[PDB]
Amino acid sequence: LRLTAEGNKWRTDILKTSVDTGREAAAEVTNLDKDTPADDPELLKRLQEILRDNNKSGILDAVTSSKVNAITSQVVSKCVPDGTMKKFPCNSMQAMALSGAKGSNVNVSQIMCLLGQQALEGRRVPVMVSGKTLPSFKPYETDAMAGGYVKGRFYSGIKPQEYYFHCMAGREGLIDTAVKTSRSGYLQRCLTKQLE
Amino acid sequence: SVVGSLIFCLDCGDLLENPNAVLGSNVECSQCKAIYPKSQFSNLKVVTTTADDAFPSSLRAKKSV
């Protein structure tokens, strides 16, 4: 599961460029000019209206999710295959992912390089009524870190806020998994009763 | 006593009946029975405008922001 020194250097250098991605995405969504400060009163007001509404929030979440997904794709592409301390076939994780024995490249990426952005239902993490995603974060925080985009990995561990966001995502996943099995049963039963 | 369409009694503070539904030329309070002549208040004018979130239109988004 380890990386090389140069692989970690690449990963951290690319992740350093994700600091302003959230602010730029928010500014683009609110139609504000780029390079605007993250604490601009007009930007804060526009994000306030976006949070109050439910469609502007969805648009902003989709745009920021696309940006952070581009960032994580860059990180994974540059680091996963040619940054590992052990290479295939010596790397058992990589061999298992590539040969289809168990797991996949997304699992290997989450373990080794980046855990990506947490999506609850095609959307970022929920927001309080005060514009705060968590007590640890500013109101109307224009930061990908305070949007569910966790920069940690399961090899080096995840910070507390990232842990909370990932717990949210896991809970939604388990709820949907529980629901779908009961959902399909009535459809199958009616189909087979008529077509038996 | 008079703020909008409402008329209040300056003595007790009860809603006086609408002057357009009384005998005429005067209306009295239903509690103090004080004399309120129909003069001194004839323009019961209210101005109201719809909320900003009442007419969601495509041009509404583009006119601002």
Partner: protein, 392 residues
């Protein structure tokens, strides 16, 4: 204690007998003023003397419950203090819980706990019933004493009010018992108070209670709901609609006394009242028993002010001036402790016990007995003819 506050706020339940005595013969006013639970003890057969001490280890081994005696003293009052007959009546063994103040392990050190066969670090918080451990699970309920702007389609859908807005408040009496008030909204420009005294629900115009709580003028209501917001045409129009609707529907109620009388004779059968309570008295009773209980009796001015605040909040909500409060967000939630539920159930069981003895007296009235309320023999005869197993 919560139990003492509950029996104090229960009040006295009154019955009459036919013995010509303005209303019906003499008066009986049964009430409870002290509920005491004792630590569990064993009679050891009939030996008695100094009672033995029971322990949870003994309860577990015997495969029975671990309960202590429950004591209530009845204030058998005849003709409003003419002749009072106090009597402490046991009500069976109330299951007590471990490590509580009414348990025998309340302050025992770990060495003593090991000596008494419990555990090195035994923790209570549970009841032993029929030799089987049990626990009253903590439940999440609405936050007390807070009016929350709530938007719900289930209001207009199958609601007597026609809107999906409202302002719900779950007030709790000082004896830890809840009574919720829903400030519904109507599409035609008025607000209807809603509550559920018994298992059924009732609706009352809000301005009714607004005038009934304290002596008020219509200008006072306008001031309370609109503070310097004279230019707010929305608020002024809604307030005018509400006041005109009240004056049109109830032109007779020009005074607090007669609006209270109307409330009283509207709520007379359900709020069980003897043929002694006047309409004004029973109206004040239902007012103190239903609307804004968390401010308690003798808080009519505070109830009036808080009702004005609730109305302003509802109008601001329907005007889009404030977001709805999420019922399921933990920000707007509290937890029912589990012992408070025990207190509520004890208060209701005491109420049912008092109503049962009064029903026995009424059955005696319907039949033909000596029915002398001043006779200790008759009082003990009617007290032994009613089930008293509150502990059971």
């Amino acid at each position: 204690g919560l139990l003492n506050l509950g029996v104090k706020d229960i009040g006295e339940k009154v019955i009459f007998d036919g013995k010509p005595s303005g209303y019906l013969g003499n008066k009986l006013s049964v009430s409870v003023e002290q509920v005491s639970i004792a630590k569990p003890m064993s009679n050891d057969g009939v030996s008695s003397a100094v009672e033995r001490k029971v322990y949870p280890s003994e309860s577990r081994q015997r495969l029975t419950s671990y309960r202590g005696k429950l004591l209530l003293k009845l204030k058998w009052s005849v003709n409003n203090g003419e002749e009072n007959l106090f009597e402490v009546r046991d009500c069976g063994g109330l299951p007590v819980m471990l490590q509580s103040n009414r348990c025998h392990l309340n302050k025992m050190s770990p060495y003593e706990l090991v000596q008494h066969k419990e555990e090195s670090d035994e923790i209570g918080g549970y009841f032993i019933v029929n030799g089987i451990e049990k626990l009253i699970r903590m439940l999440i309920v609405q936050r007390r004493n807070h009016p929350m702007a709530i938007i719900r389609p289930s209001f207009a859908n199958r609601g007597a009010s026609y809107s999906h807005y409202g302002i719900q408040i779950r007030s709790v009496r000082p004896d830890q018992t809840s009574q919720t008030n829903v400030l519904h909204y109507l599409n035609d420009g008025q607000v209807t108070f809603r509550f559920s005294w018994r298992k059924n629900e009732y609706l009352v115009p809000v301005v009714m209670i607004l005038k009934a709580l304290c002596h008020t003028s219509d200008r006072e209501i306008f001031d309370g709901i609109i503070g310097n917001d004279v230019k707010d045409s929305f608020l002024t129009d809604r307030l005018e609609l509400l006041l005109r609707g009240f004056k049109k529907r109830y032109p007779h109620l020009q005074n607090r006394t007669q609006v209270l009388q109307y409330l009283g004779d509207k709520f007379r059968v359900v709020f069980q009242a003897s043929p002694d309570q006047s309409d004004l008295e029973v109206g004040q009773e239902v007012l103190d028993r239903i609307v804004l209980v968390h401010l308690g009796k003798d808080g009519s001015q505070d109830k009036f002010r808080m009702l004005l605040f609730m109305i302003r909040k509802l109008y601001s909500l329907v005007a889009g001036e404030c977001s709805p409060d999420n019922p399921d967000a933990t920000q707007h939630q509290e937890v029912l402790l589990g012992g408070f539920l025990y207190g509520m159930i004890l208060k209701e069981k005491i109420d049912e016990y008092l109503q049962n003895i009064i029903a026995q007296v009424r059955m005696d009235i319907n039949r033909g007995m000596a029915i002398n309320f001043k006779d200790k023999r008759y009082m003990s005869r009617v007290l032994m003819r009613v089930n008293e197993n509150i502990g059971s």
